[PDB]
Each structure stands twice: as structure tokens, then as C-alpha cells.
DNA sequence: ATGTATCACTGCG
DNA sequence: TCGCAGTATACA
């Protein structure tokens, strides 16, 4: 959390680092796999180009009561905060100064689970606050495209910080990587509005 | 109403 | 194995 690779271009502003060492990350990830309860059924379908699909991964959301989060036809309410999530949130707040009330958690069982190209833009995502993507497990390729391409390997225990207006000009994705066979759990902390 | 973007898929090179 | 091309409802 002292060594940052800054990513900057017209409309792009992100920062990356390895926040947790190997041991602390293994301990956390081992806790996450036990505690996190992933959504199922209706709560795991999105609507895109006219059709519903199951997401090719698992999703959960946690955060303060009453906040919601919508994208692609689906509204999610947060389950309440569990210690391991509290612990990751607060250590992230500690290095960034920033503060968060909500966390989307995506789990990729292996390298065929993915997330398609999108922007993480939306009204309820508050002004003046970034998005913090933390990762545990397998290492997976993360790509920015400007509708030019920056490819970023997200390592075990890393933190990708995503400031304004990265989200109002560039698309991101976690493409299929067939050669990866291990799980990845990603956490993206946000500061949402009522 | 009526305009606009698409957090997903398959096909194929 | 990867990634470009071409894709009927929301929700605005």
C-alpha cells in the first residue's frame, strides 16, 4: 500500500497496488470462501440486448440498510456487514482516506467465468468518490477500452482504485482466460446514495 | 410516446 | 485461445 502504479490518460485515472501480502491475503480469502453468501435465481439474472441471462460468475452485495444498486435490469439490496468484509473495508479506507457504505462482490470459479465490457457509471454512484476493487485468489486479466486498450493483471491481495472520470469515458471487462483454473473473489467498494 | 444504451451471447478468423 | 462483429427491453 506504498507502491502504486498510476494509470492515466484523457478520461482515465486509476491506481493499483498489492495491498495485502501473501499470508494475510490467504487468511482473508480462506475466510471469504466460508462466509460470503452468493445470490441465486432471479437475483442473478441481468437483461442485455433484450434477453435475460444468468451472470457467468457469482454476485453478492453487502452494505448499509436501504441503499440499493441497479444495473442491466436488476436491483440488489445489501445484506448487512459481516466482520471479514468490515475488516477489508476499513483497511482500504485506511490507505485511501476514502469511505464506503456498499460492496459488490463478484466470484469467478475459474477462468471461464467472466464479466462483459461495461461502464460502471450511474446516478446513485455518488459524486466525488472513487471505486476500490480488491481481489483475492487466482490472478485475472482486467482490461480498459476507450470507445486503445490498457491491460492490467489483478494480483492476489491487490487494490485497483478507480477515480473520476475513469467511469464516464472508459469501459472495463474481465475477459475469459481459459488457462486459469482457480477461483477469484473480487470486491468493489462504493459509496452509494439514498 | 419515442429515443437510447446495452455488466450478455454466439460465430468466426 | 483470443477478441471483433453483430447483436427487444427497459428506463430515461
From Swiss-Prot:
<feature type="binding site">
    <location>
        <position position="106"/>
    </location>
    <ligand>
        <name>2-oxoglutarate</name>
    </ligand>
</feature>
<feature type="binding site">
    <location>
        <position position="121"/>
    </location>
    <ligand>
        <name>substrate</name>
    </ligand>
</feature>
<dbReference type="GO" id="GO:0005730">
    <property type="term" value="C:nucleolus"/>
</dbReference>
<dbReference type="GO" id="GO:0005634">
    <property type="term" value="C:nucleus"/>
</dbReference>
<feature type="domain" description="Fe2OG dioxygenase">
    <location>
        <begin position="99"/>
        <end position="193"/>
    </location>
</feature>
<keyword id="KW-0227">DNA damage</keyword>
<feature type="binding site">
    <location>
        <position position="172"/>
    </location>
    <ligand>
        <name>2-oxoglutarate</name>
    </ligand>
</feature>
<keyword id="KW-0234">DNA repair</keyword>
<keyword id="KW-0460">Magnesium</keyword>
<dbReference type="GO" id="GO:0008198">
    <property type="term" value="F:ferrous iron binding"/>
</dbReference>
<keyword id="KW-0223">Dioxygenase</keyword>
<keyword id="KW-0560">Oxidoreductase</keyword>
<feature type="binding site">
    <location>
        <position position="172"/>
    </location>
    <ligand>
        <name>Fe cation</name>
    </ligand>
</feature>
<feature type="binding site">
    <location>
        <position position="118"/>
    </location>
    <ligand>
        <name>Fe cation</name>
    </ligand>
</feature>
<feature type="binding site">
    <location>
        <position position="118"/>
    </location>
    <ligand>
        <name>2-oxoglutarate</name>
    </ligand>
</feature>
<dbReference type="GO" id="GO:0000182">
    <property type="term" value="F:rDNA binding"/>
</dbReference>
<dbReference type="GO" id="GO:0005654">
    <property type="term" value="C:nucleoplasm"/>
</dbReference>
<comment type="similarity">
    <text>Belongs to the alkB family.</text>
</comment>
<feature type="binding site">
    <location>
        <begin position="49"/>
        <end position="51"/>
    </location>
    <ligand>
        <name>substrate</name>
    </ligand>
</feature>
<dbReference type="GO" id="GO:0051747">
    <property type="term" value="F:cytosine C-5 DNA demethylase activity"/>
</dbReference>
<feature type="binding site">
    <location>
        <position position="190"/>
    </location>
    <ligand>
        <name>2-oxoglutarate</name>
    </ligand>
</feature>
<dbReference type="GO" id="GO:0035516">
    <property type="term" value="F:broad specificity oxidative DNA demethylase activity"/>
</dbReference>
<keyword id="KW-0539">Nucleus</keyword>
<feature type="binding site">
    <location>
        <position position="188"/>
    </location>
    <ligand>
        <name>2-oxoglutarate</name>
    </ligand>
</feature>
<comment type="subunit">
    <text>Interacts with PCNA homotrimer; this interaction is enhanced during the S-phase of the cell cycle. Interacts with nucleolar proteins NCL, UBTF and NPM1. Interacts with XRCC5-XRCC6 heterodimer.</text>
</comment>
<feature type="binding site">
    <location>
        <position position="120"/>
    </location>
    <ligand>
        <name>Fe cation</name>
    </ligand>
</feature>
<feature type="binding site">
    <location>
        <begin position="69"/>
        <end position="71"/>
    </location>
    <ligand>
        <name>substrate</name>
    </ligand>
</feature>
<comment type="function">
    <text>Dioxygenase that repairs alkylated nucleic acid bases by direct reversal oxidative dealkylation. Can process both double-stranded (ds) and single-stranded (ss) DNA substrates, with a strong preference for dsDNA. Uses molecular oxygen, 2-oxoglutarate and iron as cofactors to oxidize the alkyl groups that are subsequently released as aldehydes, regenerating the undamaged bases. Probes the base pair stability, locates a weakened base pair and flips the damaged base to accommodate the lesion in its active site for efficient catalysis.</text>
</comment>
<keyword id="KW-0408">Iron</keyword>
<dbReference type="GO" id="GO:0006307">
    <property type="term" value="P:DNA alkylation repair"/>
</dbReference>
<protein>
    <recommendedName>
        <fullName>DNA oxidative demethylase ALKBH2</fullName>
        <ecNumber>1.14.11.33</ecNumber>
    </recommendedName>
</protein>
<feature type="binding site">
    <location>
        <position position="184"/>
    </location>
    <ligand>
        <name>2-oxoglutarate</name>
    </ligand>
</feature>
<keyword id="KW-0479">Metal-binding</keyword>
<feature type="binding site">
    <location>
        <position position="108"/>
    </location>
    <ligand>
        <name>2-oxoglutarate</name>
    </ligand>
</feature>
Amino acid at each position: 500500500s506504498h507502491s502504486w502504479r498510476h494509470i492515466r490518460a484523457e478520461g482515465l485515472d486509476s491506481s493499483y497496488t498489492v495491498l495485502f501480502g501473501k499470508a494475510e491475503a490467504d487468511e482473508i480469502f480462506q475466510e471469504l470462501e466460508k462466509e460470503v453468501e452468493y445470490f441465486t435465481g432471479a437475483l442473478a439474472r441481468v437483461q442485455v440486448f433484450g434477453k435475460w441471462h444468468s451472470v457467468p460468475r457469482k454476485q453478492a452485495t453487502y452494505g448499509d440498510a436501504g441503499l440499493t444498486y441497479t444495473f442491466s435490469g436488476l436491483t440488489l439490496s445489501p445484506k448487512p456487514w459481516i466482520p471479514v468484509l468490515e475488516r477489508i473495508r476499513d483497511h482500504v479506507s485506511g490507505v485511501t482516506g476514502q469511505t464506503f457504505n456498499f460492496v459488490l462482490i463478484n466470484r469467478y470459479k475459474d477462468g471461464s467465468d467472466h464479466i462483459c465490457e461495461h461502464r460502471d457509471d450511474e446516478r446513485e454512484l455518488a459524486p466525488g468518490s472513487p471505486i476500490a476493487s480488491v481481489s483475492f485468489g487466482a490472478s485475472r486479466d482486467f482490461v480498459f477500452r476507450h470507445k486503445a486498450v490498457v491491460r492490467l493483471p489483478l494480483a492476489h491481495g491487490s487494490l485497483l482504485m478507480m477515480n473520476h472520470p475513469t467511469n464516464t469515458h472508459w469501459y472495463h471487462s474481465l475477459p475469459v482466460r481459459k488457462k486459469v483454473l482457480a477461483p477469484r473473489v473480487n470486491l468493489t467498494f462504493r459509496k452509494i446514495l439514498l
